[PDB]
Amino acid sequence: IGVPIKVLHEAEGHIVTCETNTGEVYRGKLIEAEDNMNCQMSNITVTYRDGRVAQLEQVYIRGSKIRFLILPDMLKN
Amino acid sequence: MWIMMRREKRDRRHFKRMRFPPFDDEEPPLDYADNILDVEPLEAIQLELDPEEDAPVLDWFYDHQPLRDSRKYVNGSTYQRWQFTLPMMSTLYRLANQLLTDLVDDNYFYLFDLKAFFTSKALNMAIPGGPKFEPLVRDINLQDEDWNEFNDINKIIIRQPIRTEYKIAFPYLYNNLPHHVHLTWYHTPNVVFIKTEDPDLPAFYFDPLINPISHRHSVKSQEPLPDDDEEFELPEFVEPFLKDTPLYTDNTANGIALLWAPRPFNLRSGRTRRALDIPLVKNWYREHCPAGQPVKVRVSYQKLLKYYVLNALKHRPPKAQKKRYLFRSFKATKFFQSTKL
Amino acid sequence: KDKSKELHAIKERYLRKFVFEWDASEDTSIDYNPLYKERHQVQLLGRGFIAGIDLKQQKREQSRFYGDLMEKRRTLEEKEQEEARLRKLRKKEAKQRW
Amino acid sequence: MDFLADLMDNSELIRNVTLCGHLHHGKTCFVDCLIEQTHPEIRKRYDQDLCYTDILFTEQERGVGIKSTPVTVVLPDTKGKSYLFNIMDTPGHVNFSDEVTAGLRISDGVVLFIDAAEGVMLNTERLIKHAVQERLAVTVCINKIDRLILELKLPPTDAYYKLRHIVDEVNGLISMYSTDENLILSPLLGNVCFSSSQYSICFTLGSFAKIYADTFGDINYQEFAKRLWGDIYFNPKTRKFTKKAPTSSSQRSFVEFILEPLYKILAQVVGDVDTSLPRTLDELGIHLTKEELKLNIRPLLRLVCKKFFGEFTGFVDMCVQHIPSPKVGAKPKIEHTYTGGVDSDLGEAMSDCDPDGPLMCHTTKMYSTDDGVQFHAFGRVLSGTIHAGQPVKVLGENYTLEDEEDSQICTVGRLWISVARYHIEVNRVPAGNWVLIEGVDQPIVKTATITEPRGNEEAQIFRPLKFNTTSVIKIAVEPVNPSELPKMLDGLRKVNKSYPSLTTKVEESGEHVILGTGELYLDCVMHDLRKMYSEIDIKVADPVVTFCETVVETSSLKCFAETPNKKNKITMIAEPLEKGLAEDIENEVVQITWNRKKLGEFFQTKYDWDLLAARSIWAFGPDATGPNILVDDTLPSEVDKALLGSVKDSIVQGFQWGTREGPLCDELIRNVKFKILDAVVAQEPLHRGGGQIIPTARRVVYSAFLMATPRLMEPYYFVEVQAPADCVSAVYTVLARRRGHVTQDAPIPGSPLYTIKAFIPAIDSFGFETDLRTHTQGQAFSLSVFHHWQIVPGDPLDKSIVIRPLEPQPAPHLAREFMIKTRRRKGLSEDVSISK
Amino acid sequence: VGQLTGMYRYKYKLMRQIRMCKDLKHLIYYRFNTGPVGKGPGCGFWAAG
């Protein structure tokens, strides 16, 4: 169990954003945070690099295209 | 000693009690050098130990200070904080069965706890098996409470009389003025323990003292279950954690039966007590009652319990000291000498 | 006689000499009702016995209720060892008796 | 520490639970184990159970939990995700059912506790029903697994048989109470946990699969978590789980891969602790030092099981995925709890638990301070956010939209979230969480809807706290010196606040009366009244039982009543109801909110009542769930319906209060049907006012009741006792002495203990809890709870019956002896007169 | 001790101990003289008193 995988598992369910390698930023609640970087969110706002933003009732991004993730640091402090 | 002294009292049809004073009364006590030193002492009262069972204690059981030399079991010659293995402790517990009631829980001590006796004392009331005490406060006028509209007889329904133990179990409901009263309702879940009697038996056995479960499959109360070779496979390495170790060893039944032993025999290790401070029959008059015994020993039971409760209630924490031993100062003094005798 | 005693108890509630032997007037076990005059002695599953009292005296004095319960529940496949252990005991304390 | 507040802010990572269970089933020890897991500095004593949540002293001395205690704790999950847990470990004694309900209204999850060696007991039989009726997800945690091994010494196969027998009995019993068919409990599904609190053992099948996966590795713990419980087996050669036996002496998967390792490890730590203990800890990775191996057997077992299993992840993931979150469970909670339901604006505002929406938090407890002066309310913020110093509006239980007078605007002094002994001060509490509000004690008794001032205009209140039992036993209370009577009034108010079903009452004779459930309950409440709140002396009358008044046959004549003006005239007939109809009213089966067609069909089919009256039934006894009934049976030609509809309300008002008091004495009237045969109402609304109809209504009700042959109904407690088979006769002899009778004597499967279920009169059941244990020398034990009411033997209205002062009367005199003394206790007349 | 030594005549409180010991005797005897033991001077369980 790694520190980043543990932070991704403990950061699931709260409001956080995740930017992929293609510029797609999905912000919402991480419903499923797997150990392989697979992030599944429900009702998340996905904004592409062109500027168009939409809402997804159930989205799931794989861990191969994971760029960065910004979540609330209240659990670390 | 208890198990054998009952046999020579059964073997000796009559008993030749030693004369008193054994030494000629008003006669200078016999010198130790001329008589006692040479005469070989007679054999002492001792139980022959079975090497097949009592072997863990066979080597040293009747010594002056058992296991004094063994650094493994005791700390040293100061003779404190002994450590005993489970076979040793189980053998001692089996040998002490004559001085130990086979009570596993304390639910048998419902209204014979010392807290209930404190309540009975503070209420000037007596459990039928319990002792009598002087009133904490005379309150004779308070005993002579007048016939009010509160405690009026014609307003009171009597179906079953309010016995003393009722007023003791609930000393804030059935009585008035409960000062210096204590509470006890420690109905610990009555431990369901069945001590083994078969020397040869599986330690985890379904003995007939347990009502059969009587498993049934009449109604198809099914649950999510798989079929054979259905999307699952186990690694060759994985196994139950403990395959080599047996389910139960020989020392498993003794160890489990040692959990519910009395206070002295549930300790793997503990400090050393004095010969004075071990009340052997303490758990005898603490028992509920004597089963159909005459009056002159029933009153003996209440009079033992009375002093026990008085000591428990009047107990105070020991006062802080500076530990000035007496014989140590004697050894420091030039006027005294030490000698084994 | 229990009724008169219990009604009398209800009425009670709501309305130099170096002697060593105690008096019989300090006895408290006197009870006006049967449920405390004759308490159900703990059979303790039949396998537990009072400390001071002798073992086999209790065994023969015991109510035998658990004995017949075991006789009812025990099956033949596991009665052989019961009979064998019982006879081996009878023999080994017969050693002491003889 | 601040992560506590950060997680507090979120509303989806929060669980509201109650560890409700039978008496002495390890619930308090379970919470103590959770505390020992979280707080490192809090270490339990080697022998004495710490009992962390038992904070008040009386439960620290009696050994029984008495009042629910809030526990707010952050628990890691199986995967390591922190969750904020609100724990309401309700007291297990059936006489303390008050706090189970008080903690169940403000919780969304039910975690049952069942002793592995005791099986389903009396208490649990009512908690499953209650939790289902309150619409909470139900989960079972069989506690004290050690009893099947260290005490029963059952073979592992028989241990599994016992476990499945107690698991399916819960499923079989709950199918009567639960209408939905999604409520099937099984450890493979994840509903059932197995634990031993004393030795800190705790696991769900998923958790144990996680241990094996942790050891061996490359194991998916979900698939292996499934295929563990059941009749399937494991084939050592093909490495596949099969329904059929792979060998002749096969073994179930659960026993083979869970129960057997537990047996072996605890047998190795209780047997051969000196020879084969290091060998069995090397094989398990549990490394211990010398000094932690020199302890006794119990601490060593607890330490080794803590090291092997680890943290209490099994309970956490059992709870997380099988009880709804507040954001998910709010809708059923509101539609069963809020008076207006979800339909109203505030009702819809609750379905989402918005932290910034309207604040109408609900408080259902009173946790006093250490000086007993002020009462800190405890409640769940169902929505909105609260702050320290915020000016808030506290509602009441009689507060409605029309009756705006039952409220007070207060100032929330401080806020803190509490975990047993120590409290954590917080300035802000978001929605869907618990809180001790301070400074709101003054306008509240028991429950309260603390909401926003001038912001929630149409907001209603939450439904009154409905219980499972009934306050039956009744004790009189007076000061020793009447010169300090007011000192006792405030103490009685305080104990009324800190006990949900306590019913203080002053009667005409200047008598103060306290209503309770059982002997231990009244003992505790009076100990609180004496040593905690009033610190004065109090005289108590010996406990007495409330009675009920009923009929058996119709009156000989149609006795009527007229107003003093001799203008209105109402004629009514009192007759008994159908056997079982009264129960079908108190169970909320039928209501007054029903439409006419549904009630008409109900009474046409189930009770074959004629439609000429089935659509002419006004009221249901006293209050709303009252077992009595008012029936309109006047032919329309003689009684004008338009004229009737004016007094249709006032007659009920004089009836709903008429049956409450009772003519014989001030006791409830139960199981009576009132037929109106003639109504002569004033043609003008001037002289037919309530002040004339209502006395006439009560007089005609009393006259019909008296002319009908009256009877007293005494409440019978349902008593279960657990005793070894050698003491079953010792229970029969005791129960026969108190007019009781035994219903069943069933041995508990997998245990020598029995279960004798009997009924006993409540007035005859005083001291029986002690009359049994002392007679059986503590082996037997009894629990009591109100079951039903029965006609007291004899006729209550015979003048030939003489009541002697201080000795019990036979059965035929009881109905005469009980009321008259009751009448004498009520200060009323010696006998009953037709004028009343 | 009272019968053998007249020490109670020089400190009355000793009667307590005296009675205490006698009570202990009764306790041990009734537990000692059980079954086929019979009554007699055959008890040496002195550590109790």
Q: Where in chain A are the domains?
A: 1-77
Q: Which residues of C touch B (CB under 8 A)?
A: 6, 9-10, 13-14, 21-24, 26-31, 33, 36, 39, 41-42, 44-45, 47-52, 54, 66, 69-70, 73-74, 81-82, 85
- Evaluate whether D322 touches D191 at the Cβ level (below 8 Å): yes
Q: Which long-range contacts (CB under 8 A, 24 or more apart) does C45-49 make?
A: C45/B194, C45/B195, C45/B209, C45/D724, C45/D752, C47/B102, C47/B194, C47/B195, C47/B197, C48/B101, C48/B102, C48/B103, C48/B104, C48/B195, C49/B102
**Cβ <8 Å between C31 and B128:** yes
- Evaluate whether D731 touches D775 at the Cβ level (below 8 Å): no
- Evaluate whether D459 touches D341 at the Cβ level (below 8 Å): no
Beta carbons within 8 Å of B279's beta carbon, 6+ residues apart:
E48
Which of D2, D4, D6 has the most A C-beta neighbours within 10 Å, making it the best mutation to test the interface with A?
Answer: D6
**Cβ <8 Å between C53 and E2:** no
Structure tokens given for D155: 């073979």
Q: How far apart are CA D666 and CA D508, in angstroms?
A: 10
B280 — contact with chain C (CB < 8 Å)?
no
Structure tokens given for B250: 């020989």
Closest CA–CA distance from residue B174 to any residue of chain D (Å): 6
**Cβ <8 Å between B128 and C26:** no
Residue D761 known to bind ligand: no
Q: Give the burial class of D74: count Cβ atoms within 10 A of its Cβ; 0-12 exposed, 13-18 middle, 19 or more buried.
A: middle
Contacts of D12 in chain A (CB under 8 A): 13-14, 29
Closest CA–CA distance from residue D503 to any residue of chain C (Å): 28
B191 — contact with chain E (CB < 8 Å)?
no
Q: How far apart are CA B30 and CA B33, in angstroms?
A: 9
**What are the distances in angstroms from CA C47 to CA B94, C66, D93, D648, D814?**
14, 10, 32, 73, 46
Residue D89 known to bind ligand: yes
Contacts of B304 in chain E (CB under 8 A): 20, 23-24, 27
The length of chain E is: 49
Give the residue among B284, B314, B322 at the shortest CA–CA distance from B300. Answer: B284
Which candidate from C22, C28, C44 shows the least CB-CB separation from B128? C28
Q: Given the DSSP bridges, would you call strands D511-516 and D448-451 parallel, antiparallel or unpaired?
A: unpaired
Contacts of D80 in chain A (CB under 8 A): 1, 6, 9-10
Which candidate from B5, B281, B296 shows the least CB-CB separation from E44? B5
**Cβ <8 Å between A13 and D12:** yes
Chain B residues 279-298 with a CB less than 8 Å from chain E? 279-281, 284-285, 290, 293, 296-297
Which candidate from E16, E30, E45 shows the least CB-CB separation from B5? E45
Q: How far apart are CA D92 and CA D22, in angstroms?
A: 5
The dihedral formed by the CA atoms of D531, D537, D543 and D544, expressed in degrees to the nearest 10: -120
D82 — contact with chain A (CB < 8 Å)?
yes
Which candidate from C18, C22, C57 shows the least CB-CB separation from E34? C57
- Evaluate whether D400 touches D423 at the Cβ level (below 8 Å): no
At residue B5, the 3 state secondary structure works out as: helix
**Cβ <8 Å between A77 and D12:** no
Backbone CA torsion sign across C48, C52, C54, C58? negative
How many Cβ atoms are within 10 Å of B282's Cβ, its own excluded?
A: 12
**Cβ <8 Å between C35 and D727:** no
Residue D21 known to bind ligand: yes
Q: What are phi and psi of E19, to 5 degrees?
A: -60, -40
Chains that touch C (3 or more CB pairs under 8 A): B, D, E
Contacts of E31 in chain C (CB under 8 A): 51-53
Contacts of C18 in chain E (CB under 8 A): 2, 8-9, 15
Residue D27 known to bind ligand: yes
At residue B83, the 3 state secondary structure works out as: strand
Crossing angle of helices D122-133 and D97-104, rounded to 10°: 30
Backbone CA torsion sign across B71, B73, B79, B81? positive
The dihedral formed by the CA atoms of D631, D637, D643 and D646, expressed in degrees to the nearest 10: 10
The dihedral formed by the CA atoms of D135, D136, D141 and D143, expressed in degrees to the nearest 10: -80
Q: How far apart are CA B89 and CA D105, in angstroms?
A: 52
What b/e sequence results for B220-233 when a residue is b if at least 16 CB atoms lie within 10 Å of its CB, and e otherwise? eeebeebeeeeeee
Question: Strand pairing partners for D393?
Answer: D409, D451
Residue D417 known to bind ligand: no
Beta carbons within 8 Å of B118's beta carbon, 6+ residues apart:
B180, B181, B182, B309, B312, B313
At residue A44, the 3 state secondary structure works out as: strand
Which candidate from A6, A29, A75 shows the least CB-CB separation from D6? A75
Closest CA–CA distance from residue D6 to any residue of chain A (Å): 5
A75 — contact with chain D (CB < 8 Å)?
yes
Q: How far apart are CA D19 and CA D35, in angstroms?
A: 14
Residue D597 known to bind ligand: no
Contacts of E16 in chain B (CB under 8 A): 307
Q: For tokens 């103490």, what's the residue?
A: D491
- Evaluate whether D387 touches D23 at the Cβ level (below 8 Å): no
CA D818 from chain center: how many Å? 30
| Approach to solving | cryo-EM
Q: In Å, what resolution does this model reach? A: 6.9
- Geometric angle at alpha carbon D767, from D765 and D769, rounded to 5°: 85
The dihedral formed by the CA atoms of D247, D251, D257 and D258, expressed in degrees to the nearest 10: 180
Secondary structure tally for chain D: helices H, strands E: 26, 34
- Evaluate whether D565 touches D556 at the Cβ level (below 8 Å): no
- Evaluate whether B101 touches B110 at the Cβ level (below 8 Å): no
Which candidate from C28, C48, C66 shows the least CB-CB separation from B126? C28
Closest CA–CA distance from residue C71 to any residue of chain B (Å): 9
Crossing angle of helices D205-216 and D313-320, rounded to 10°: 130
At residue D678, the 3 state secondary structure works out as: strand
Q: How far apart are CA A47 and CA A26, in angstroms?
A: 6
The dihedral formed by the CA atoms of D451, D454, D456 and D457, expressed in degrees to the nearest 10: 130
The dihedral formed by the CA atoms of B248, B254, B259 and B265, expressed in degrees to the nearest 10: -150
Q: How far apart are CA D240 and CA D247, in angstroms?
A: 13
Residue D466 known to bind ligand: no
**Cβ <8 Å between C42 and D807:** no
Give the residue among D755, D698, D701, D749 at the shortest CA–CA distance from D725. Answer: D755
- Evaluate whether D669 touches D659 at the Cβ level (below 8 Å): yes
Which of E24, E34, E45 has the most C C-beta neighbours within 10 Å, making it the best mutation to test the interface with C?
Answer: E34
**Cβ <8 Å between A74 and D79:** no
DSSP state of A26: E
D80 — contact with chain A (CB < 8 Å)?
yes
Give the residue among D622, D621, D639 at the shortest CA–CA distance from D630. Answer: D621
Q: How far apart are CA B327 and CA B331, in angstroms?
A: 6
Which candidate from C49, C54, C66 shows the least CB-CB separation from B102? C49
Give the residue among D21, E23, D127, D321 at the shortest CA–CA distance from B297. Answer: E23
Residue D179 known to bind ligand: no
Backbone CA torsion sign across B22, B27, B32, B36? negative
How many Cβ atoms are within 10 Å of C97's Cβ, its own excluded?
A: 7
Q: How far apart are CA D683 and CA D693, in angstroms?
A: 14
DSSP state of D724: B
Closest CA–CA distance from residue D775 to any residue of chain C (Å): 5
Q: Chains B, A in contact: 3+ Cβ pairs under 8 A?
A: no
Contacts of E15 in chain C (CB under 8 A): 18, 20
Which of C13, C35, C62 has the most D C-beta neighbours within 10 Å, making it the best mutation to test the interface with D?
Answer: C35
Question: Strand pairing partners for D139?
Answer: D111
Question: Strand pairing partners for D429?
Answer: D386
Q: What is the CATH number of domain A1-77?
A: 2.30.30.100
**Cβ <8 Å between E22 and C57:** no
Secondary structure tally for chain E: helices H, strands E: 1, 0
**Cβ <8 Å between B187 and D184:** no
What b/e sequence results for A56-71 when a residue is b if at least 16 CB atoms lie within 10 Å of its CB, and e otherwise? eeebebeeeebeebeb
Q: Given the DSSP bridges, would you call strands D137-143 and D192-196 parallel, antiparallel or unpaired?
A: parallel
Backbone CA torsion sign across D614, D617, D621, D626? positive
How many Cβ atoms are within 10 Å of C75's Cβ, its own excluded?
A: 7
The length of chain B is: 341
Crossing angle of helices E14-32 and B295-313, rounded to 10°: 130
